[PDB]
Amino acid sequence: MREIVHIQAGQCGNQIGAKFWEVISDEHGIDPSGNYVGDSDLQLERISVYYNEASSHKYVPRAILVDLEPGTMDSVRSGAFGHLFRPDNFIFGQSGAGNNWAKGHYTEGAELVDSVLDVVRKECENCDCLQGFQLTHSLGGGTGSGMGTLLISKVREEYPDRIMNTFSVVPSPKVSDTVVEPYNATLSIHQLVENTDETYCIDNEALYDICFRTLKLATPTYGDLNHLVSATMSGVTTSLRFPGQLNADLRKLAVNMVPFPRLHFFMPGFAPLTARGSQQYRALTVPELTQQMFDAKNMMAACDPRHGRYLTVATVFRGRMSMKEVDEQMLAIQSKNSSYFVEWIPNNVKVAVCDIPPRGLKMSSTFIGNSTAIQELFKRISEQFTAMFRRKAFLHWYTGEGMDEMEFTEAESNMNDLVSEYQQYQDAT
């Protein structure tokens, strides 16, 4: 019931997915071999949402792993928690898209898109009652960006009424991990604005700042950042896989969180986050989580919300807690924060609560913020795009794969239109 197919594109996509599936296996109590070693029936009563029951009491992930270089697939296979994946789903290329969105969306992605779509079709037929898809990829590299855009387009053309999630890593403002990420990000955001029902913008700089400041980790590897991203994934999805005093799912958050079809770009947040030693010096109560969520230093997007306005705010909770208290904290945080909330949306906060805490922790939360501040992000990219589009910089690569400049102009125009809509709805009264 309400099964979800997980797709991973790009190296960051596979790494986030590996950590994500480790987190889900921990939550549902599954060995790397795939057997059930939990201790409560509730872990199994909704096991089918992410896991398919093979024979001999074995559970396999309903995940699709896509890349164009075998290094990532070999890394996933060799390490622990690698045997549970179905070996047929390990679809990979040979040459790698080479940071070029053309090869990820037009040239190289075309040689594997058919196989990926057949596997997705088989999984869709095998599932009981499909809910929707979630994609984990990045907008910096060519492979993840282009291939994810292509797959999302084809799938939505194959399934119109389903819902599709994308958790796309957005390039940092200060530094760039690649050189030609403006074009790739522009085209990928174009595909997303056409054919995605919501996206969670995530930035490496924000995670670095959070982990260094809040977590007090002087040596943060990608392991920890992927762990936080996976925790956000699980916190969003927890309302569907377990009971709650107020049940929710992806559909409820999508409906509440998207007042206009284009505006579906959100920011994630997690709580509580503590250093190793500073964990017992605080009582984990609802208002502490509430005051931890609503601040810049706990936002995984590189844009201060006080530069703009909060349009809608979704809060998912986990753990045995009193509903009146959650409601009171939401009411207080809205009343004392009338300025950063839209006036023409009275009660712009959605609340969902589960019953199962995230392991080791007595209770936790998860924050989804639909705010206009992210438009700054777009503007920056847009400006960089022009700075790299005015002199025809690196364009000859994408023209040599068959594409035209007209797509770049049209996509830039559409992103500028999106920025204009964000600004106008910011200025609405």
Partner: protein, 435 residues
């Protein structure tokens, strides 16, 4: 399954091959007899496997003079190479692009192409060719030009990297280097998917300053170049936290089709006696890289602009430290970026630390960094060559050797205008825009 072949042209090419393949055999635990007594099959890239445990390299050593080839054949790495890939001529081109491109090069080009085709036909995912040649010798320049032509005509779109020994500003070994360099640059400009300039004088300076070797030989320069190529191919040959392919190099470093000349730098380069006393933080080695002294070309970037940079780290490298170091470099004063490019850094991470060669000069470290930078100051170097060329072309010196060998004055002219046009293009790219 991820294959990439090497082509070493000229005496410099063969010596770089000796160093690089010594380094590779050390990296993958390969005895000189080809046996095997962070790792995937890592060796499947460079090393093809026979029925037994013997592994043979996918490389072609071609040189018209039998001296260095005989030295390789009779050397320690005798049993390793397949005897076919040691291709020899009879007479050397003798610093004559004419002899190495029209008269003598044609006599063995078919065999080289045939062996390259044999190597390629048994691969599965061949990405490209690593070409090691000099611009000084006639053999290197001319035969490399002919081979690039033939490969481009035969193989359509495959990355073809050139790791050249660019002639030094003042420390030259030949007299006719300008002619050969201009001719080979003009010829290979439309086949070289990306060419990495390396200069001898700068490596001499680095070795005297850092390695504290008052009297090094070509062996050490070959060792540094081998370390560079190993750092380049580490992402392909090993598991990494952030992998990068050859097409990524070709894409992120080339803004315009005609300007495809990055320059290399390696760090750290410190002796065993100086291996201690300093911890090699990633910020420290990055600052060492962006320092103009550690550069391997006599061109100072501080009078130009940085179009693009690609940093490859290997070893126990923490990515947040990478971010902090790169931001600090961005804040500095001696790194001013060009107008059209607000984002000119690529980062790649590999877990495998660099491998130390026994009997070498460097010291075993835990982190290593290679900087591949496409900047503007390199254009200045071209001007120097042009000037020299014009001087040597003022009195028609040494022209007869080319003319009487199957060569025309008209290509000398055409190459001169092509070099001038390349300089004009570099200058135009340098300037800032209106609005």
């Amino acid at each position: 399954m991820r294959e990439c072949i090497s082509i070493h042209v000229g005496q410099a090419g063969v010596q770089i091959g000796n160093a690089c393949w010594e380094l590779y055999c050390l990296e993958h635990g390969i005895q000189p007899d080809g046996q095997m007594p962070h790792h995937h099959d890592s060796f499947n890239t460079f090393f093809s496997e026979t029925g037994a445990g013997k592994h043979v390299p996918r490389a072609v050593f071609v040189d018209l003079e039998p001296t260095v080839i005989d030295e390789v054949r009779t050397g320690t790495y005798r049993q390793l190479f397949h005897p076919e890939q040691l291709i020899t001529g009879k007479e050397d081109a003798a610093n004559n692009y004419a002899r190495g491109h029209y008269t003598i090069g044609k006599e063995i080009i078919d065999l080289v192409l045939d062996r390259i085709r044999k190597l390629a036909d048994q691969c599965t995912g061949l990405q490209g060719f690593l070409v090691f040649h000099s611009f000084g010798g006639g053999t290197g320049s001319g035969f490399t030009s002919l081979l690039m032509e033939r490969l481009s005509v035969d193989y359509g779109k495959k990355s073809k990297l050139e790791f050249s020994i660019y002639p030094a500003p003042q420390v030259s070994t030949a007299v006719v280097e300008p002619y050969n360099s201009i001719l080979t640059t003009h010829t290979t400009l439309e086949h070289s998917d990306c060419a990495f300039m390396v200069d001898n004088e700068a490596i001499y300076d680095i070795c005297r300053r850092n390695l504290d070797i008052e009297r090094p030989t070509y062996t050490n320069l070959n060792r540094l170049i081998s370390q560079i190529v190993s750092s380049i191919t580490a992402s392909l040959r090993f598991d990494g936290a952030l992998n990068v392919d050859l097409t990524a190099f070709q894409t992120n470093l080339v803004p315009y089709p005609r300007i495809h000349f990055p320059l290399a730098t390696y760090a750290p380069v410190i002796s065993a006696e100086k291996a201690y006393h300093e911890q090699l933080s990633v910020a420290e080695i990055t600052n060492a890289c962006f320092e103009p002294a550690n550069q391997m070309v006599k061109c100072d970037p501080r009078h130009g602009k940085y179009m693009a940079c690609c940093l490859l780290y290997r070893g126990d490298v923490v990515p947040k430290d990478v971010n902090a170091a790169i931001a600090t470099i961005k804040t500095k004063r001696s790194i001013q970026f060009v107008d059209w490019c607000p984002t000119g850094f690529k980062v790649g991470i590999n877990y495998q630390p660099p491998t130390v060669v026994p009997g070498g000069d460097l010291a075993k470290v835990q982190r290593a960094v290679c900087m591949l930078s496409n900047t503007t100051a390199i254009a200045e170097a071209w001007a120097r060559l042009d000037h020299k060329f014009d001087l040597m072309y003022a009195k028609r010196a040494f022209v007869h050797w080319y003319v009487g060998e199957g060569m025309e004055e008209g290509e000398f002219s055409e190459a001169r205008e092509d070099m001038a046009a390349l300089e004009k293009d570099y200058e135009e790219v340098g300037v800032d825009s209106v609005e």
